[PDB]
Design a protein that fits this description.
Length: 296
């Protein structure tokens, strides 16, 4: 499209963006551990809980990247897990919400990152990958193109970010290295690169500089269409004591929302965060979307 007023519509923010822009270049809000919104069992909450509203509230808030963690059960279906504990949500439940959302707003697209979160239930018939691919990915909302994905190709579809290994069906982003608790950079497809900052379990101080430091690298390398930058602003530590992702999220979100507002960057990469809501001060998701003002 052409006006800047069109990024202010959360439900349809990607409408003004040009069809030829690689998804890499776009600045996208994303949600960390998206399916933990039904955990209300207290101690589960202080540990597991990273969101408080549903996939649709999340989507009508501009989120276009979803951190999905699953586990294969006996019933031969994939469910959503937070480590060893079961969220009361399933993969089918995610996929349909993404479909009705995407049907009401065909201009958008959604990126689903799938990772096998826990070990397969004993009586499962097939492996995690073969199951997801034979019973779900075979659906056609799934974009099946590879390489450096442009936006034209994905409107209407679900783009897959593979965080599982033995895959046989082509589509979305190829699985890549992803080392534990760090900030790293690797190659995805022949044509792409990724810098990821995912230091969960680290101190507030170190957390806050890893984010900004990685944010600085992207604002600068802004015209590099062939380079994704993922920035998880989520920090996870010993809950039960206001050391919960909420407590940190109520600091890190406004903190960084502002960091982008003042710096007026052109690109901020993909910012996966906790507690997407409307309590916090400047709104991290709105600032991230707005930084796309430069592509319009």
């Amino acid at each position: 499209a052409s006006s800047v007023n069109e990024l202010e519509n959360w439900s349809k923010w990607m409408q003004p963006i040009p069809d030829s822009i690689p998804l890499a270049r776009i600045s996208i809000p994303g949600t960390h551990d998206s399916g933990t919104f039904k955990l209300q069992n207290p101690i589960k909450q202080v540990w597991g809980m990273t969101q408080e509203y549903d996939f649709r509230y999340q989507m009508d808030h501009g989120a276009r990247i979803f951190d999905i963690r699953g586990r294969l059960t006996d019933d031969n279906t994939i469910v959503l897990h937070h480590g060893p504990l079961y969220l009361y949500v399933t993969l089918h439940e995610f996929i349909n919400e993404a479909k009705q959302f995407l049907k009401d707003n065909p201009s958008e697209t959604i990126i689903m990152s799938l990772k096998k979160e826990y070990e397969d239930m004993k009586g499962a018939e097939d492996s995690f990958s073969s199951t997801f691919e034979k019973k779900y990915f075979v659906d056609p909302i799934f974009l099946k193109t590879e390489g450096n994905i442009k936006l034209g190709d994905a409107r209407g579809k679900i783009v897959l970010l593979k965080r599982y290994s033995g895959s046989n069906e082509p589509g979305g982003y190829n699985n890549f290295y992803w080392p534990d608790n760090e900030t790293f950079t690797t190659t995805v497809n022949q044509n792409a690169n990724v810098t990821v900052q995912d230091k969960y379990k680290v101190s507030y101080d170190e957390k806050v500089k890893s984010i900004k430091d990685t944010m600085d690298e992207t604002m600068n390398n802004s015209e590099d269409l062939n380079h994704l930058y993922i920035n998880f602003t989520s920090l996870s530590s010993g809950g039960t004591a206001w050391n919960s992702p909420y407590y940190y999220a109520s600091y890190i979100n406004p903190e960084i929302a502002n960091y982008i507002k003042q710096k007026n960057p052109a690109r901020v990469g993909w910012v996966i965060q906790d507690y997407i809501n409307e309590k916090w001060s400047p709104l991290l998701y709105q600032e991230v979307i707005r930084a796309n003002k430069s592509l319009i």
